[PDB]
Amino acid sequence: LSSSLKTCYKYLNQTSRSFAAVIQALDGEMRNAVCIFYLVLRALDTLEDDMTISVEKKVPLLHNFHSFLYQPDWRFMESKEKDRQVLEDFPTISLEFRNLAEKYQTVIADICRRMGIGMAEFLDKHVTSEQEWDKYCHYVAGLVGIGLSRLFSASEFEDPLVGEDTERANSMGLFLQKTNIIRDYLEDQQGGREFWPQEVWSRYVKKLGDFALPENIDLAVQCLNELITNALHHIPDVITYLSRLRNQSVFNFCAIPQVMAIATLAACYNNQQVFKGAVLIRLGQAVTLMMDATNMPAVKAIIYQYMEEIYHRIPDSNPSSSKTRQIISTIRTQ
Amino acid sequence: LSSSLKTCYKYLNQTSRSFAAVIQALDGEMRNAVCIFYLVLRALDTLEDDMTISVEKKVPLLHNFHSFLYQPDWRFMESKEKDRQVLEDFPTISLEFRNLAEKYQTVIADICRRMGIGMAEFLDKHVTSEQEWDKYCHYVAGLVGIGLSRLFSASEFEDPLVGEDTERANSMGLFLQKTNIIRDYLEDQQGGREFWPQEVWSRYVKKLGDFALPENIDLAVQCLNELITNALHHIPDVITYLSRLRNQSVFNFCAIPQVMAIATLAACYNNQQVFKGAVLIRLGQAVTLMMDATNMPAVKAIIYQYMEEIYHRIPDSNPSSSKTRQIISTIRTQ
Amino acid sequence: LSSSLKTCYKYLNQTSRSFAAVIQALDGEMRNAVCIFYLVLRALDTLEDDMTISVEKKVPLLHNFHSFLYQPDWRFMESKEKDRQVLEDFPTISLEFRNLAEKYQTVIADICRRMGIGMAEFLDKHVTSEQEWDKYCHYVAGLVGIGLSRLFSASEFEDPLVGEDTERANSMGLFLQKTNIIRDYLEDQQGGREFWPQEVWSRYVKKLGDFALPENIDLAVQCLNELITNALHHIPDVITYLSRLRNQSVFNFCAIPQVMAIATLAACYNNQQVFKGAVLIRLGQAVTLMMDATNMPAVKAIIYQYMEEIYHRIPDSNPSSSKTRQIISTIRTQ
Amino acid sequence: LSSSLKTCYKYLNQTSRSFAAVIQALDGEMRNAVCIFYLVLRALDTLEDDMTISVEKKVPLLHNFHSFLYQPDWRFMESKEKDRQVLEDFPTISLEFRNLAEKYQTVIADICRRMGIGMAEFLDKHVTSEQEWDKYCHYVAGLVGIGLSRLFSASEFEDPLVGEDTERANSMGLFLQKTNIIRDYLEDQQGGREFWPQEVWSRYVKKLGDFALPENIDLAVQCLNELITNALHHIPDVITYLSRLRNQSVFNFCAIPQVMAIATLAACYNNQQVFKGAVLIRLGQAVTLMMDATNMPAVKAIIYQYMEEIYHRIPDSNPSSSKTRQIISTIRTQ
Amino acid sequence: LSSSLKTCYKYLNQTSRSFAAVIQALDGEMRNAVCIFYLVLRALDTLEDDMTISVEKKVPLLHNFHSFLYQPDWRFMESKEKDRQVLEDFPTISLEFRNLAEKYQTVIADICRRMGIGMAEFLDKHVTSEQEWDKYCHYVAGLVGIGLSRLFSASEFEDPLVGEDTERANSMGLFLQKTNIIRDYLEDQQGGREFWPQEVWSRYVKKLGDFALPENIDLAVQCLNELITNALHHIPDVITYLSRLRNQSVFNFCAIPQVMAIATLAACYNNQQVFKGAVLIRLGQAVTLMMDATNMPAVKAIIYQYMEEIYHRIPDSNPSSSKTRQIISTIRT
Amino acid sequence: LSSSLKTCYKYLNQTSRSFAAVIQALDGEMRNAVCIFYLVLRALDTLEDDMTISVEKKVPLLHNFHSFLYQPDWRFMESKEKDRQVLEDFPTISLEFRNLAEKYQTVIADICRRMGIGMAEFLDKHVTSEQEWDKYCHYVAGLVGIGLSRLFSASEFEDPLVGEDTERANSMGLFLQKTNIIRDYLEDQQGGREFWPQEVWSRYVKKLGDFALPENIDLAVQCLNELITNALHHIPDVITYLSRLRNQSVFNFCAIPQVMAIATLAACYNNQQVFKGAVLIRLGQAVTLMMDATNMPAVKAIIYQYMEEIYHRIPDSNPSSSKTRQIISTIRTQ
Ligand SMILES: CC(C)=CCC/C(C)=C/CC/C(C)=C/CSP(=O)(O)OP(=O)(O)O
Secondary structure, eight states: OOHHHHHHHHHHHHHSTTTHHHHTTSOTTHHHHHHHHHHHHHHHHHHHHOTTSOHHHHHHHHHHHHHHTTOTTOOOOSOOSTTTHHHHTHHHHHHHHTTSOHHHHHHHHHHHHHHHHHHHHTSSSOOOSHHHHHHHHIIIIIHHHHHHHHHHHHTTSSOHHHHHOOHHHHHHHHHHHHHHHHHSHHHHHTTTOOOSOTTTSTTTOSSTTGGGSGGGHHHHHHHHHHHHHHHGGGHHHHHHHHHHOOOHHHHHHHHHHHHHHHHHHHHHTTOTHHHHSOOOOOOOOTTTTSOOTTSHHHHHHHHHHHHHHHHHHOOTTOTTTTHHHHHHHHHHHO | OOTTHHHHHHHHTTTOTTTHHHHHTSOHHHHHHHHHHHHHHHHHHHHHTOTTSOHHHHHHHHHTTTTTTTOTTOOOOOOOSSSOHHHHTHHHHHHHHHTSOHHHHHHHHHHHHHHHHHHHTTSSOOOOSHHHHHHHHIIIIIHHHHHHHHHHHHTTSSOHHHHHOHHHHHHHHHHHHHHHHHHTHHHHHHHTOOOSOHHHHTTTOSSGGGGGSGGGHHHHHHHHHHHHHHHGGGHHHHHHHHHTOOOHHHHHHHHHHHHHHHHHHHHHTTOTHHHHSOOOOOOOSSSTTSOOTTSHHHHHHHHHHHHHHHHHTOOTTSTTHHHHHHHHHHHHHO | OOHHHHHHHHHHHHHOTTTHHHHTTSOTTHHHHHHHHHHHHHHHHHHHHOSSSOHHHHHHHHHTTGGGGSOSSOOOOOOOSTTTHHHHTHHHHHHHHTTSOHHHHHHHHHHHHHHHHHHHHTTTOOOOSHHHHHHHHIIIIIHHHHHHHHHHHHHTSSOHHHHHOHHHHHHHHHHHHHHHHHHTHHHHHTTTOOOSOHHHHTTTOSSGGGTTSGGGHHHHHHHHHHHHHHHHTTHHHHHHHHTTOOOHHHHHHHHHHHHHHHHHHHHHTTOGGGGTSOOOOOOOOSSTTSOOSSSHHHHHHHHHHHHHHHHTTOOTTSTTHHHHHHHHHHHHHO | OOHHHHHHHHHHHHHOTTTHHHHHTSOTHHHHHHHHHHHHHHHHHHHHHOTTSOHHHHHHHHHHHHHHTTOTTOOOOOOOSSSTHHHHTHHHHHHHHHTSOHHHHHHHHHHHHHHHHHHHHTTSOOOOSHHHHHHHHIIIIIHHHHHHHHHHHHTTSSOHHHHHOHHHHHHHHHHHHHHHHHHSHHHHHTTTOOOSOHHHHTTTOSSGGGTTSTTOHHHHHHHHHHHHHHHHTTHHHHHHHHTTOOOHHHHHHHHHHHHHHHHHHHHHTTOGGGGTSOOOOOOOOTTGGGOOTTSHHHHHHHHHHHHHHHHTTOOTTSTTHHHHHHHHHHHHTO | OOHHHHHHHHHHHHHOTTTHHHHHTSOTTHHHHHHHHHHHHHHHHHHHHOTTSOHHHHHHHHHHHHHHTTOTTOOOOOOOSTTTHHHHTHHHHHHHHTTSOHHHHHHHHHHHHHHHHHHHHTTSOOOOSHHHHHHHHIIIIIHHHHHHHHHHHHTTSSOHHHHHOHHHHHHHHHHHHHHHHHHTHHHHHTTTOOOSOHHHHTTTOSSGGGGGSTTSHHHHHHHHHHHHHHHHTTHHHHHHHHHHOOOHHHHHHHHHHHHHHHHHHHHHTTOGGGGTSOOOOOOOOSSGGGOOSSSHHHHHHHHHHHHHHHHHHOOTTSTTHHHHHHHHHHHHO | OOHHHHHHHHHHHHSOTTTHHHHHTSOHHHHHHHHHHHHHHHHHHHHHHOTTSOHHHHHHHHHHHHHHTTOTTOOOOOOOSGGGHHHHTHHHHHHHHTTSOHHHHHHHHHHHHHHHHHHHHTTTOOOOSHHHHHHHHIIIIIHHHHHHHHHHHHHTSSOHHHHHOHHHHHHHHHHHHHHHHHHTHHHHHTTTOOOSOHHHHTTTOSSGGGGGSGGGHHHHHHHHHHHHHHHHTTHHHHHHHHHTOOOHHHHHHHHHHHHHHHHHHHHHTTOGGGGTSOOOOOOOOSTTTTOOSSSHHHHHHHHHHHHHHHHHHOOTTSTTHHHHHHHHHHHHTO
C-alpha cells in the first residue's frame, strides 16, 4: 500500500510490457528486487539510447548511473524519449530501491556499475566483429542475466549454484539480445542505429542499410541466416541454465522469454519478411500444443520442435548451411 | 462400481457443465464428496429456481433441506425446471451422501441448512445495496466456497488453514457468482430475475430492465464497468486462497474456474456485447499463450495479464475510471 | 562427439514428426534407448510395408530382424519405401544399439523378435474377428508399449510395476493403434490395405471399400461409431497407466500421445467427413482451455471433457448407443 | 544378465576395502561407471608398484594403458603383486568399460592417459619438494577426483560446476592421498618405497628409514606434524567441494572417505605410534556419536570436532605449531 | 487423552520392544493405525502360540479372530502365554480399532482374516519343503508386510504404488521372519515348536533336534548356512521395496528392522553359537562408522558391507558355497 | 578474515566443547550471531562463577554486562576462572557483537540484560522450591533457548513461531540444565555449590551433602529419581520444539544436545553411580544403534527408546515410582 511501489509497478507494466506479468509472479522478495532492477536498467538504457545527448555528457552520466541510486533527488528531465518518465520520476524508483534488502542492492548497483562502463565503451564505435558483438550483448543483456542469477541465489529461492554460473547466466542474456537485434532490424535502421556486427554483414553488402534495399533480398536473407546460426549456439547453455532452476516462478520468468526467442528465430529464419516490416511468431507443431513452457521436459520438446522448423527449411544454396545443421545436430544429441 | 453412484456422475455431467471435469479429476475421497456436494447444492438451487412453486410451499423445502438427505424416500416429482431428475431421483443422491465419512456429511450438512435459510431470506426481496449483494452471493456461492475449503481440510489433502479462513473461501465464491450475475444479465432479465444490485443500476436508469433496451446501452456499459470494478476486489483474496493449496488435484478444480472468470470479466469490460448477445472469452497475448493455470506462478501471470487488458481499455470519461485503476494498481503491487 | 549417434537423431526427426521432440526430451539414459528403440522399430516397419518384396523373402527378414542388431555389417539396400535410409544405413543404428546398456538391449531385442513374428503372421491375411484386431494391434503397437514400459522401469526413472504390468502397457499400445486405424480409414482403402476388423464392417456392408461410396455413409458412420466405442474401452487402462508414471519427461512422452488419440476419437465420432477427408482436431473445450496435459489431474479433466463431447453426441438411433454410454459412464465413475 | 559385470564387482570388493560399499550405493549409471573406473585405475596402479618389472619395460605400459582399454584381449600375466587378478583378467574389465556409455569412456580414458604420463615421470625419480609432492599426488589421486567429478557432471546427477572446477576436485584427491602417505609410513619403509617429500623429512634425519629407528621418535613425530599441517590446507577446498553436492548417494561416496582421512590425520597428529605400528582411528567426541556423515552440516560439525582434537594437542615446542594453528583457524573462520 | 489409547501404547511397549520406538515415530494417523495393528497381531499370534489350547478349540479362534475385532466385549482368559495381556484386555484394543478411520480397519480386518486361515492351516503340520516355508512365512509375516504397505498408502503419507506392490511387501516380511526362525533355533527347540524346513534339515540329521547335540555341530552349521543363503535372496526385493518409500518416518520404520535382520544373519553365518546359545550383533566396520540406516544410499552401503562380511567367511567346503556366493553376487551388481 | 572474528572462534573452541562444532556448522548469518552470543554468555557466566569477585563487585558486573556490550573498551582483568580470556579480551568480542545485524543485537543484549539481573538474584541464596528450580534454570538456560530461538527466527532460517513460542524454548533450555544439575551432583558438592532443590532433598536427608555418604545411597537414589522424573516433563515440549525446525544446521544444533541429555538421564536413572563417580552414556540398545539424530522421525525414536530404558528400570518400591510411569506414558501417546 506504498505510493512509491504502486508507481514503480505502474512503470514496469509501462516500459517492460512483456515481462511485467511474470515479474509480478516471482515469489516473495524476488518480486520487487527484479521489478525495480528492470526499471533501473530500463532507465539506464533510455539515457544510453537518447541521442539528443552529447557523447561527452552521456559518457560521464553513464559511468555514474550506478551512483545515482543513492542520490535521493537525482533525476533527468532533458530526456526526450518515450520512456523518459523513468528518468524524470526516478527518485521514486531510487527510494524503493533503497528499501530493498542490502543483498539485492549490492547486486543491482554492481551491475548498473559495469553495464554503464560498457555501454559507454560502445558509445562512439560500432559492433566490429562477432567476437566483439558478444562483448556488446554481454554489456546490455549478458550482465542482466548474471544480475538476475545473483538475485535468485541471494533470495535463497534458488540454489547458490545459479549465481555462480555466469558463463551460462550470460548466454541467457546474449541469446535474447542477439534475437531482438536480429528481429527488429529495419526498426534499428529506420531509427538511426546499426547493430548487426561487421566482418559479417560486410561480406554481403557495403552498408548494412543496403539490406533494406529491394535488389538485395538474396544477400539480405543469407546474412540473416548465418546471423541466426550464430545465436543458436546459445541454446545448449539456455537448456543447461533452465535445467538447474528449482523454483517454478523463477522457471517461468526465465523460460518463457527464452522460448519466445526461439519461436522468433524460427520465424525469422530465412524469412524475407524480416526486411519488409515485421514477422509474426507462428507457434509449433500439433504436439507442443498441449505443453506450456513451465516444466523442463516441455520446454525442451518445444525447443526441439522449433529447431525442426528451422532444420527443415535449411537451403543448400545457403553458404551458412552445414554450420546451421552442425549446431542443430548438437542440440539434438546433447 | 455402484449402480447408483454411476447415476450420480451421469447427473454431474448433466448439470455442472463447468465443474464436472475438475470434480472427477479430484483425488480419492474429494472425488465422491465434492461430486455429491454438487448434486445436492444443485437440488437446493433447482428448487429456488422453479417459480411454479408457491412461496408458501417453497420456503419450507429450503430450510428442511439439510434433512432430506437423511430422508431415504424424499423426492419432488412436482417440478418443471430442467435439472429435475436430481430431485425425482434424489434418493440415489441422498443414498450416496450417507456413504461419505461423517466428517464430509457434517460439512455438506451445516451448509444446505445455512443456505436454504439465506436463499429463503431472499425469495421476496431483490438485491438493494452493494453490501446486500455480497450477502446474497454469500448464501448462494460464498457458502459453497467455504464448504469446499472445509472438505479440503477434512480430507487431510490440504492444510487445516484453508477451511479455517472462511473469509478467503467466501471471496473465492463471490468472485465466481458476481462474474456470472454480471455476464448473464440479459438472460436473467429475459428470464425475469434481477440479481444486479439496485443501489447501483438505479443510479443509471429507472428499471434494472432498461439495460436491455438498445437505447440505454451506453448507460448499461457504464454500470457494467462499475460492477466489474467491484468484482475485481475479490482477486487479491483469490490469489491468496489459491497459493495456500498444496494438492495438484484440488488446485486445478479451484484455479481454472477463477481464471475462467477473470478472463470473462476482461472479455465483458466496457463491452456492449453483454447487453446484446453472448461474449466470447479469449486468452492473453503470446506470453499467456505459453502458460496454463495448473501452477500458481503461471496463474498469477495470467491474472496479471488480464488486468492489464482491462487497464488499457479504460475510458477517461467512465464514471469508475479511477476506481478501476485503483484496484488494478492494488493487484499489480500487492 | 559421435557422428553415429548424431546421424541417428537425424533419422529420428526425418521419420517421426510425431515423437522426435518428446523423445529427445527424455531424461538421462532413456533418451538414447527410446530413440534407437524407435529407429529399429521404424526400420522393421519399413520392411513389413515394402511391397516390392516377395513374401517368400520378407518373412525371414521380419523373423530375423532382431538378429541384424548384433551384426555390424547387416543392411538392406533393395528397398523403395520412404524411410529406406534406416535400412540402408542400419549398421549406424545397430552400432548404437550395441552401445546402450545391456538391459535395454535385451528389451529392444525381445520386442523386435516378437513383433516380427507377429508381423509376418499378418502379411497373408486381414483382420477377421474383433479379437484378431486386438492381436494385430498387439504386434504393431501393444508390444511397443510393453517394450517402452520395460525400458522405463529398467532405467529406474519409473517404478518397477510400470514394466511388470504388461496388460496396462498393451492397452496404451492398442488405444493409439486402433485410433489411427479408424482415422486413417480413407487413406488405407485408397492403398489396398484392410485394417478395420472385417467381422464388424461385414455386418454393415459387403466390401470394406463400400463405406467410401456415399450411398452407404449412414451404415459407415454407423460402423465408425461401433469401433470408436470398442477403442474407448482402453481408456480406463490408459488412466491407470498414466497415473503411475512419476517422471515428468516420461509422463509427457506418454500422456500427450494419449490425449491426442482421444481428441481424435472425439472429433471422428459420428463425424461423416471421416469417409471424405481428414478430420480436424479441434480444441480442449473452453475449460481445458487453460490446462495442458503435463499433470495427471489435468490429463484426467481433459480426458473427461472429451468423454462428454462424445456423450452429448450419441444418436439414440445408433445401435452402439447403449455400449457407448455404458463405457463413458464406467470411465467417469472411476 | 551379465556375468562379467558380476566378476567386476567381485574385484571391486577384493581390491577396494574402502570404497566398494559407497560405490555400489551410487545411483544408476554412476554405479558401473565408478566401479569400472576404479578397476582400471587399480590395474594401472598395480602395474606401477610392481617392482619386478624393469623401468624401460614399464613406461610403454603406463603410457599405453589408456589405449589397451580398447584392446579386447590385452592382459598382463607377468605381475607378482597381489591385486594382479585385475590385470590377468583385464579383458573382462575392459569389456565392461567398452559397455559403458561413450561419454564416460572419454572421461575415464583421458584420466588414464594423463595418469600414465605422470606415473612414468616419477619412476626414475623421488619426491623432493612440497610442490613436487603435490605434483605426484595430482598424478595419482588428484586426477582421480577430477575424473569422478567429470563423471558426476556428465551423468547430470551433479551440477555442471562439480566437473568444471578442477582445483577443488584435485584437492579432494590430494587430501586423501597425502593422508595415506602420512600414515602408511612404516608399512612403506618396510617395503622399499619412499613417499614423504625429501626437502622435509631430510631436514630432520639423514635417511627416511631413520624415523623408523626408536632413537629418533622426537624427529619422527616432529616431521609427522609438519606434513599433517601440510595436509590440513586442503580442508577448506574439501568443505567447499562437498557443499555443492546435491545427490545423496554421491555425497555419501565423497564425504565418508574424507571424514575418514581427517579422522586419521587427527589420530596421527603428534602420535609416536605412526612409527611403530598402525594407528587406530578412535572416533571423536560424544557429540559426533549421534551424528552421521550424510548431510553437509553434520560433516561440517565432524570436521570441526577433529580440528579441535588436533588444536588442543598442538604442543608449543613444535617446529610448526604456529603453522598448524594458523590453518585450523582459517578452517574455523570459513 | 484417551485412557484406552494410552493403554494400547502401554501394551505396544510391553509386547514389542523391537518396534515400539519406530512405530511411535510414525507420522500422523499411521501412528495409531500401526500401533493397533501390532496389538491385534500380537494377540492372534499369542493364540497360535499357546500350546495349551486344543487344535479343535484353536481353529475356530484363528478363523473368527477378525470378527472379534467388532465384538466389543470379546476377550480371552484361558491363555497361559506371557503376551496374553492383550488377549485378556482385548476389548480396549478393539475399542481403539473401531476408532481408527474405516480405510485402516478394512486393511487390518482383512489381514487378520487371511492370517487366521493360514495359522490354522499349519497347526496340523510341520514345514517341510522350502516352498512351504514361504507359504508359512507368508501367513505370519508377509501379510504383515502387505498390510503395512496398504496402511501407508491409505494414510496418503506414502505412494499408492507402495501398498500395491504385494510381492515385494511379502518379501520384506519373509525376510524378517526367516532371520528369526533361523536365529531362534535353540530357543524354538526347548519349546517344542519346529520351524526349520524338514526337506532341508532332514538331509543333515534324523531329528531336527539333533542339531542341539554337540557332535552334530558341523552338520548344524552347514544347514544353518543353507538356510541363511535362502534368506539372502529376499534382499534384492527389500532394497527395491525400501527405495520406493518417500516419507522419513515410514522409511526409518521399514529400514531399521531390515538392516537389523541383515546384521543378524551376518553374525550367525557359519557361526556355531546359534546351536549353543545366543549370537550378539556386531556392527559397522570403517565405512559404517559414519553412516546410519536413515537414507537409502547409506542403507545400501551398510547392507553391502554386511554381505561382504559373510562373503569373506564363506568356507569353500560348505555344501552351500556356490549359492552363498552366487546370491551375494546378485545383491552387489 | 577479520583478525578479531578469528580470535572469537578460537575462544569458542576453548570455551565450548559441547557446541563449538555444531555452532560453526550453522548456516549464513546464524553462524556468527550464535558464536558471539555464546562468547558473551560465556563471559557473564565466568563472572558469576569466579568466587574471588566480591558480591559488592559482582552484582554491578552482572546487572550491567549487557551495556558492556556497546562499550568499546570495557574489559575485566581480575578474573581467576580459567575462561577469563574472554573477559580480558572482551573488547574484541564486543567489537564483533556490534557488527552483527542490529536485529541480532536486540536479542543478545536482552538475553544478557535479563540473565544478569536473574543471576544476581540468586547470588546469596540456593534453590528451595521446585518452582524455584525452574526460575533458576530459566535465568541460566531457558533464556538461552529463547535467545537462540529468537535468533533463528530473526535470521529467517526458521519460521517466526520458533521465536514466538518462548515457553517451548524455555523447556529445551531447562531440560538440558536440569539434567546437568543431576549428573553433576558430586562434582558440584566438591565445590560447595548446591543446585538440587532444597524442598526436595530436604525430605530424604538433612543436608544435601549426606548423599555422598555410602549409607544414604538408598535415599540418595530415591531423590535422584524424583528430579529425573521432574526433568522428563519437559520432553513433550522438546519434541514439539524440534518438530518445528526447517533448517538442517539448526536441527543438528538443537537435537544433538537434547538427545545427549536424555541419554544421560537414562544412564543415571536409578543408578547408584551418580553418587560414586561419573556415569557414561550406555550404547543405544539395538534398535537405536543404526540411528543418528539428524531427522525428526529418528530423534523421536531415539527419545522414545531412552524412555523405555528408564521405564524398564523403575522399581515399584520407588517413592516416585508412579509419577515416573505416568509422565512417560503421556510422552508415548502424544
Ligand atoms: C508409451 C506407452 C506405454 C505406449 C505407447 C505405445 C506406442 C507409442 C505405440 C505405437 C502407436 C502408434 C500406432 C503410433 C503412431 S505411428 P507414426 O509415428 O508413424 O504416425 P505419424 O504420421 O508420425 O504421426
